[PDB]
């Protein structure tokens, strides 16, 4: 789940506070603290976000010709459900036998 967590982090950081902090210093026309931090987050953060996006884009790219990157694709998980059904029917039959026994005694 490494790639999933990376994509989630990239999505959470896409709408970062940089896009909202570009309208903070312009309102501060009465006092000039660490206001310089409102300058370094103008384009460097966007540049890093774009670099990370391009890096994530340049992944393995499994899909080339047909339908690769499988992984469920397969066996008796179905028959495992059927085995659970067997368990349920055995439960039903045992309950019926117990009811028959109770009726007989």
């Amino acid at each position: 789940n490494e790639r999933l967590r990376a994509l989630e982090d990239i999505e959470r950081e896409i709408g970062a506070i940089l896009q909202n902090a570009g309208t903070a210093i312009l309102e501060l026309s009465k006092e000039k603290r660490l206001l310089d931090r409102q300058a370094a987050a103008f384009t460097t953060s966007v540049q890093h976000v774009e670099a990370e996006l391009s890096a994530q884009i340049r992944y393995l790219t499994q899909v080339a010709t047909g339908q690769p990157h499988e992984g469920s694709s397969y066996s008796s998980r179905k028959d495992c459900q059927m085995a659970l059904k067997r368990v349920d029917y055995a439960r039903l039959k045992i309950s019926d036998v117990a009811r028959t026994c109770e009726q007989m005694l």
Binding site: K93, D96, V97, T100, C101, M104, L105
Partner: peptide
């Protein structure tokens, strides 16, 4: 009744 109880199992 014993055989009746038997039959099921």
């Amino acid at each position: 009744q014993l055989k009746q109880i038997m039959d099921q199992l």
